[PDB]
Amino acid sequence: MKNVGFIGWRGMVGSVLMDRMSQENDFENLNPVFFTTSQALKSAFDIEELKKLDIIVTCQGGDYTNEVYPKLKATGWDGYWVDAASALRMKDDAIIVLDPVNQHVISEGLKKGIKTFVGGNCTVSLMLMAIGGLFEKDLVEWISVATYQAASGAGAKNMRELLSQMGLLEQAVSSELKDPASSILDIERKVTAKMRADNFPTDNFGAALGGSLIPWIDKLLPETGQTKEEWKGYAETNKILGLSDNPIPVDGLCVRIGALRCHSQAFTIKLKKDLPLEEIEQIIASHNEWVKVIPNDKEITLRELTPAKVTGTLSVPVGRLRKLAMGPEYLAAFTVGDQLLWGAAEPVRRILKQLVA
Amino acid sequence: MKNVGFIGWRGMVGSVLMDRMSQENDFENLNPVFFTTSQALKSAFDIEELKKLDIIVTCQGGDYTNEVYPKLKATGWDGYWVDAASALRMKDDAIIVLDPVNQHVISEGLKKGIKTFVGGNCTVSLMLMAIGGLFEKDLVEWISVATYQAASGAGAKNMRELLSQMGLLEQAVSSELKDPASSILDIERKVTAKMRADNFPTDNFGAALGGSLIPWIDKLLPETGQTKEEWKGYAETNKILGLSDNPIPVDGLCVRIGALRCHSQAFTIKLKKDLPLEEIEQIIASHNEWVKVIPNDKEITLRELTPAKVTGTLSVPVGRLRKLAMGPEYLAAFTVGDQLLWGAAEPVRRILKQLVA
């Protein structure tokens, strides 16, 4: 059996991985070695210890990767590096994994001798898992996106801050709310007042999230005006599909909203050919076993297409499908997916399963 | 001075109108007559009393309008009907007002002898107030929208439900949150559990809003697959600009999020000609005194382009402006506007000021 070392397995992403791996009994087929950065298991900074492993799975982070990775491969280490961090995604000797979408790219890479595999951007993979079928048929000319991103994508503390913010907003009018005859505008003035108060906790987002939203995620790229988050749309979608030569335009705005762990996305998809809505749906639905097409019905949409429904599950619903007024080659679509699963730990867990097979 | 009757002035929208009118001393130039539907001022159902008025301003609602309106005009009444409700927006003898945008349409209508004026859809007017300049130059070929709509658009009770939901979510982990060393996944499991509980109050939205979102607003229109809310984008934008002959395509997805009273919108705008980003901004910024162009800078965007900042103000910021990967004629834009002001009471207040001038 393969000797696999794990780093950052105690973090939030790492913990989801450990849990999913237990659930699927992945540990039965490999020999796990756990590392730590603490000086209170092996040291994550001991290159010789890591050098003995066949595979390394890290959820530790980019700083860790940029530090340890170059050293280890510099020793001649011929093993596999499976990383969740973005650090290596855009390396020539690396491949971005999303096997239900790009297995063919993964296989060929393994044969080509690639030894570094990295999970991709959460919003990008959640998009591909949803509308992968369209890409598989080369039916996508371009795609405009508007995202509704969860706090988990920013971190555990960001999630807690969001929750604290929600608490304080309500507390500011807890009694008024109980009084069924109370004034709505007065309640409103008070909650907005607290949202704006000096003691309203916004250290992590740099702005209120609960009761609001933030149309900016990550650093700005002066070159295009996009934020790194929005940039990853074009860059990562194509590297995953292996189309850096004939790049499919993917762009839009990435916005943070008060959700815990599911990212939702509104798509304006330009199809290369006018096809009947029903044929589009069938194509969408048959690409993989997780995507789920939700009928353009109100009650079903309210029960299925929301963070409330998909949180903590591997289901990737896509609905509100219809043609847009701009023309029969313009498709509207809305999807919801869990950020910590297909958006983080799952792709990692699945490339590992293949490597130890 | 004109004799003006007011109906529904005690509701939420009505109250914002009364407040704004007081603030601007609008009552000094007209003779107000207040009505009520209660049987506990005049009766809103007394046609003869209403018949004596020069102008009628209603924030009462569509049911009221559809009931009383036809009766009154049936008596020969030659006065003005100013309505906030959507009921008459699409009537041939009616005009949708947004004077900073379509004053020319309003003036010509008054001369043509039009006697019914109606405020338009909140998202549509908030859009036009933001990017009106582009329309004024016939630079817009089409526009794809994705909205982040506030609870106030649905009603006062919906706002309270949103607040109660936020309260319960945090309460479900109030202590855990205080413990800086507590488990993030555990907290997450608990909040999601409460969100899904039978006692989680969702009577008004029919689904959780706090901690989530709802990609569906209003009834479905089997004909196009759009919801009435999404339909109003194409229909109302053009009737306001007076282009029902040469309709500019406006479509997208309308989604409800946990915000109190500001609607935000992500735009994918297709310009009819490739113009330099800086010329686009200047054009945007000079259309009206309320729109505000926010530089594509992070700190400024976090301070200016959010519901937290614009709530309760007449400011209509628009930012994140840049060209989209699909081509130099593809513009990205994000705007935030207060739903109860330019999205409801303000247009009404301003057409009134003109009518009593």
Swiss-Prot record, chains A, B:
Listed result of changing K232R: 2-fold increase in affinity for ASA, nearly no change in affinity for phosphate, and 30-fold decrease in activity
Stated consequence of mutating R256K: 2-fold decrease in affinity for ASA and 825-fold decrease in activity
Family matches, as Pfam families: Semialdhyde_dh, Semialdhyde_dhC
Binding site residues for phosphate: R89, K232
Binding site for substrate: Q149, E229, R256
GO molecular function: aspartate-semialdehyde dehydrogenase activity; NAD binding; NADP binding; protein dimerization activity
Catalytic activity line of the entry: L-aspartate 4-semialdehyde + phosphate + NADP(+) = 4-phospho-L-aspartate + NADPH + H(+)
Result for mutant: R89L: 7-fold increase in affinity for ASA, 150-fold decrease in affinity for phosphate, and 1400-fold decrease in activity
EC number: 1.2.1.11
Alphabetically ordered keywords of this record: Amino-acid biosynthesis, Diaminopimelate biosynthesis, Lysine biosynthesis, Methionine biosynthesis, NADP, Oxidoreductase, Threonine biosynthesis
Pathway(s) of this molecule: Amino-acid biosynthesis; L-lysine biosynthesis via DAP pathway; (S)-tetrahydrodipicolinate from L-aspartate: step 2/4; Amino-acid biosynthesis; L-methionine biosynthesis via de novo pathway; L-homoserine from L-aspartate: step 2/3; Amino-acid biosynthesis; L-threonine biosynthesis; L-threonine from L-aspartate: step 2/5
The keyword Nucleotide-binding belongs to this UniProt entry's keyword annotation: no
Binding site for NADP(+): R10, G11, M12, V13, T37, S38, Q60, S152, Q339
Gene Ontology biological-process annotations: 'de novo' L-methionine biosynthetic process; diaminopimelate biosynthetic process; isoleucine biosynthetic process; lysine biosynthetic process via diaminopimelate; threonine biosynthetic process
Catalytic residues (positions): C122 (acyl-thioester intermediate), H263 (proton acceptor)
InterPro entries linked: Asp-semialdehyde_DH_CS (IPR000319), Asp_ADH_gamma-type (IPR011534), Asp_semialdehyde_DH (IPR012080), NAD(P)-bd_dom_sf (IPR036291), Semialdehyde_DH_NAD-bd (IPR000534), Semialdhyde_DH_dimer_dom (IPR012280)
Family label: Belongs to the aspartate-semialdehyde dehydrogenase family.
UniProt note: domains: Consists of two domains, an N-terminal nucleotide-binding domain and a C-terminal dimerization domain.
Assembly information from the UniProt record: Homodimer.
Function description: Catalyzes the NADPH-dependent formation of L-aspartate-semialdehyde (L-ASA) by the reductive dephosphorylation of L-aspartyl-4-phosphate.
NCBIfam families: asd_gamma, PRK06598.1
Protein name: Aspartate-semialdehyde dehydrogenase
Lineage, highest ranks first: Bacteria, Pseudomonadati, Pseudomonadota, Gammaproteobacteria, Pasteurellales
